Design a binder for these strands. Structure first.
Lengths: 133, 84, 247, 256, 86, 162
RNA sequence: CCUUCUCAAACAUUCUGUUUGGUAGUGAGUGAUACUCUUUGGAGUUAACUUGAAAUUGCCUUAAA
């Protein structure tokens, strides 16, 4: 027997849990709505998972919408086998750069410039191709 | 409005104020203002026109306010009802 | 019914507002502080469009001058966002098609770019003011009766003088100088007036009427512009004849 | 700075490293790498740069690629209303003098309509290399061209100020496409600690061009941006030293 | 029925066309038939000055159509141009 | 009464939405009106009378013409009404396109097709080569009629209805 | 059933010239080379590739009734 959840792919831009829950509630109040968003550069992965109340609500909403078309996108939506356990994909965002540096004085960092460049000329010396500086 | 171009008055009930003009405030009644001053020779100057922002031959004035504070010398006052 | 399309539609519309005004506020950040290091331009403008379409650019650099405000719908797809909805809420222009005067100083000026894509705007003329008040305006008044959650047409000079006894004002044509030549603070004149509800230019849902409805969708969809740049200069038009029609 | 003979032994002995026997187009490209403390901070900025160079590797890119597989060719983007003003056969009378001719002059209107559909898009832009645009639109290009073709300094548009003052007329397009052509090598200034300008193709003119290029560019950008260390390679290469500057290094301690 | 016809289908262009192709009739025969010639015209007009000036007052709403207002007021100003100049 | 499998394949049509989309498309393509041709040919008439032609576009709607586009094969999608006075006329299209691998689509009403074409009726209106603007909307559209109509409706081929 | 930041000042008067600014993406994945970093926290950056806007679980109401 299948699951109560509905897999949804093909999710256009401007279609999120506002719109997900907003629309799909018409099939009954849904337990869960998740949209798979991007770890950075905030936007989605264009698919998400849902679950409503009972298997029947999933029947209704799915089959009603399974091939439904919108904007440029026809939305392939279908249930899953027993369970399938929506787990992960928390709401993400675009996590801004945190800049810590540079705690050390030019001692070890300008050193590591030195030793790193010296051993660099070592590296090109292994190539081997002979340079200077 | 309406410049009127081509191609004796009531003898003599109208055609009064021969080369003679009036001034009116803003406060003078708006629906009735230019009527007989256009129907009997002369000018109308409303302070309302100066809300865009003459005052020379003016003698008679018109104020419907309860009071005028203060007057002006060379201007011989009348209420609006005078025009009647 | 939801009409699921409509859902996403509103959404994207709303987004174009947010990201717009947000940018605008950051411009309002760097035109507040003159904190500019690298920006587009620190100078604002007004885009003056008149009528085949003859245009030009200026800058307001006030010099307080009244903008005339006529609200008409747009852009039809959008849920009001916060800051727009409030900055209007001052001008109470929701329940749309509400015409109002607003004096524009340079503390009035930059707050416009939020209102830009809503009301159509332009310096009025005399006969537009006198003619627009002479046919409209309403006063909320109490006396002798009337606990009154009710609005009164403008006739009675008793209320004219009476409520204007503060400023020593009779005869709302005094307010004309208070407005046309922009009298003291100007404010209680218009707050007084409880500003205006236009009749829509052409009524709707009829046979021949539906034509005119389309023609309006045409010209209204052209002459109403935007940048959406946060550098968007304001749009100004000649509203006089517009109010020969609308009022 | 810097010694001539250093980068000259690096470029000739580099011709040694490329002397050993698409993939070729991968190998032979000579790239100039440059670093610093940090590049311009906490802003993704797509602004490009017009470099002043000894000459342009455009013309060698053309002639040597006239037989190539990719066969690059030219674009430019006009504004809305200038399109009908400047025809295609207008601007052909002129550009020829330098041996350089555009193909197609389109409106972003057409990018937003016919050239959307991201496969129709990326397949329409990916067959190019050198790009043009106009500034006034370039501000609007981020959303239209989309997150793909800004991944190549190739495809990301150069900007230009085409419009004249006021009411643009074509003369400045005629001479100013030459201006954007002959002396200038656009280059991009991303975030991070690292930028590698894409320089040239080895099979083009003798190192006498390339070494001077290295000079003018190198000391050019050294000035303003206070770089840390500078390298050169051929697309693949373990880096080649030229100017190792620890002087301005200590500026790290200046602010911190 | 034609405009609701095409417009029922579509074809905005057609609708425009009909919009021009139509015309409003000319009253004028009855002005010469009913009030010949000059004086009979003057006769009752004052009844039309009542409404001319009333409507030329009126604030614009629907079933007013500020056009009507505009010609009304304009011919007020032309009438009063004829008396006030008269 | 029981109706043959080759009938009752009408009565299965496109939904509110998909139809709505199809007309979102074609309403771009209205074959120009008569007064239109009179327009352009009058203006050019005066032009070349005193004082460079991209291939025009429309939907190709002649029934004979339409079946002519098919069997070549040319067309891309075909719209077929559900009501023809001699219901005979169209009975073979849904088979035909079938065997020829053409995206046929049943859209309800002959007034509804007839109105996009500047006629009173069509019962068949179809297009093959389209401008590049909507080419994607086409590929997806036909993908939608495949997916909606075509997919689960193989059943209609058997099963006397009624 | 949505429609896209299509320009600025400055400088010098030349049918144009000079100069500084102004631009955050559909996503998915291929990837051999580096830079840089900081205490494992792997962070920002490095050639150039495939793609039907493809998929699976990286903690205001007159655009009504």
């Amino acid at each position: 027997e299948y699951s109560g959840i509905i897999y949804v792919s093909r999710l256009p831009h401007g279609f999120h849990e506002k719109e997900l829950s907003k629309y799909f509630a018409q099939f009954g109040d849904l337990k869960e709505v998740r949209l798979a968003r991007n770890k950075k550069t905030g936007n989605s992965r264009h698919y998400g998972f849902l679950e409503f109340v009972n298997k029947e609500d999933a029947m209704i909403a799915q089959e009603s919408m399974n091939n439904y078309l919108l904007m440029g996108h026809l939305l392939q939506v279908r249930v899953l086998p027993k369970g399938a356990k929506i787990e992960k994909l928390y709401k993400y965002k675009k996590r801004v750069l945190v800049e810590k540096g540079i705690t050390k004085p030019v001692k070890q960092l300008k050193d590591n410039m030195k030793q790193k460049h010296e051993e660099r000329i070592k590296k090109l010396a292994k190539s081997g191709i002979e340079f200077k500086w | 409005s309406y410049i009127l171009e081509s191609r004796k008055y009531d003898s003599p009930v109208a055609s009064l104020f021969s080369a003679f003009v009036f001034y009116v405030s803003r406060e003078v009644p708006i629906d009735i203002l230019e009527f007989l001053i256009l129907s009997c020779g002369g000018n109308v100057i409303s302070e309302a026109a100066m809300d865009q922002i003459d005052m020379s031959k003016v003698t008679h004035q018109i104020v419907d306010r309860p009071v005028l504070k203060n007057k002006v010398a060379g201007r011989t006052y009348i209420q609006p009802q005078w025009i009647f | 019914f939801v009409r699921a399309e409509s859902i996403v539609a509103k959404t994207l519309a709303t987004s174009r507002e947010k990201e717009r005004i947000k940018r605008v506020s950051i411009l309002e950040d760097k035109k507040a502080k003159n904190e500019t290091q690298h920006i587009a331009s620190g100078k604002d403008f007004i885009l003056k469009i008149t009528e085949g379409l003859i245009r030009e650019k200026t800058t307001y650099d006030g010099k307080p001058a009244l903008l005339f405000i006529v609200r008409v719908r747009g852009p039809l797809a959008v849920n009001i966002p916060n800051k727009a909805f409030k900055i209007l809420s001052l001008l109470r222009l929701v329940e749309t098609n509400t015409g109002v005067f607003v004096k524009l100083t340079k503390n009035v000026y930059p707050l416009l770019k939020v209102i830009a894509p809503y009301v159509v705007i332009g310096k009025p003329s005399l006969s537009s003011i006198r003619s627009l008040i002479q046919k409209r305006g309403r006063i909320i008044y109490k006396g002798e009766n009337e606990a009154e959650p009710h609005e009164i047409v403008l006739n009675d000079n008793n209320i004219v003088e009476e409520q204007l006894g503060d400023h020593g004002i009779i005869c709302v044509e005094d307010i004309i100088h208070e407005i046309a030549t922009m009298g003291e603070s100007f404010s209680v004149c218009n707050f007084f007036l409880q500003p205006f509800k236009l009749n829509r230019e052409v009524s709707g849902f009829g046979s021949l009427n539906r034509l005119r409805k389309i023609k309006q969708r045409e010209a209204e969809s052209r002459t109403r512009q935007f940048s959406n740049a946060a550098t968007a200069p304001v749009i100004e038009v000649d509203i006089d004849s517009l109010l020969a029609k609308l009022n | 700075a810097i010694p001539r003979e250093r980068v000259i032994k690096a470029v000739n002995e580099l011709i040694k490293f490329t002397s050993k026997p698409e993939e070729e187009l991968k190998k032979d490209l000579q790239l100039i790498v440059v670093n610093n403390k940090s590049f311009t901070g906490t802003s993704k900025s797509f602004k490009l740069k017009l470099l002043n160079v000894k000459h342009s590797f455009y013309k060698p890119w053309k002639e040597a690629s006239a037989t190539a597989v990719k066969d690059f060719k030219v674009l430019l983007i006009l504004k809305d209303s200038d399109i009908k003003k400047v025809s295609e056969d207008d601007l052909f009378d002129q550009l020829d003098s330098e041996g350089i001719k555009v193909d197609e002059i389109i409106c972003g209107k057409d990018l937003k309509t016919v050239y959307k559909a991201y496969e129709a898009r990326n397949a329409f832009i990916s067959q190019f290399s050198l790009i043009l645009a106009d500034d006034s639109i370039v501000t609007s290009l981020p959303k239209l061209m989309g997150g793909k073709a800004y991944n190549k300094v190739e495809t990301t548009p150069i900007s230009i100020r085409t419009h004249a003052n006021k009411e643009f007329s074509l003369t400045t397009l005629t001479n100013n496409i030459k201006k954007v052509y002959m002396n200038q090598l656009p280059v991009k200034l991303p975030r991070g600690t690292t930028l590698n300008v894409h320089l040239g193709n080895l099979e083009w003119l003798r190192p006498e061009e390339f070494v001077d290029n290295v000079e003018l560019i190198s000391e050019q950008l050294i000035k303003a941006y206070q770089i840390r260390s500078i390298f050169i390679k051929t697309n693949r290469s373990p880096v080649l030293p030229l100017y190792y500057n620890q002087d301005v290094l200590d500026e790290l301690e200046a602010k911190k | 029925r034609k405009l609701t016809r095409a417009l029922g289908r579509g074809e905005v262009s057609s609708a425009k066309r009909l919009e021009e192709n139509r015309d409003s009739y000319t009253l004028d025969h009855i002005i010469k038939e009913r009030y010949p010639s000059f004086p009979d015209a003057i006769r009752d007009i004052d009844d039309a000055l009542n409404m001319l000036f009333l409507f030329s007052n009126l604030p614009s709403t629907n079933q007013v159509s500020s056009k009507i207002i505009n010609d009304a007021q304009k011919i007020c100003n032309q009438w009063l141009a004829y008396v006030a100049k008269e | 009464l029981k109706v043959p499998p080759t009938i009752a394949q009408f009565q299965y049509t496109l939904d509110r939405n998909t139809a709505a989309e199809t007309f979102k498309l074609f309403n771009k393509y209205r074959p120009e009106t008569a007064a239109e041709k009179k327009e352009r040919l009058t203006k050019e008439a005066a032009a070349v009378a005193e004082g460079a032609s991209p291939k025009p576009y429309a939907v190709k709607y002649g029934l004979n013409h339409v079946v002519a586009l098919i069997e070549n094969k040319k067309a891309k999608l075909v719209l077929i009404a559900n009501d023809v006075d001699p219901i005979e006329l169209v009975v073979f299209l849904p088979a035909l396109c079938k065997k020829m691998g053409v995206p046929y689509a049943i859209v309800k009403g002959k007034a509804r097709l007839g109105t996009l074409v500047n006629q009173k009726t069509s019962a068949v209106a179809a297009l093959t080569e389209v401008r590049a603007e909507d080419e994607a909307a086409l590929a997806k559209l036909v993908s939608t009629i495949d997916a909606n109509f075509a997919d689960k409706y193989d059943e209609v081929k058997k099963h006397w209805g009624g």
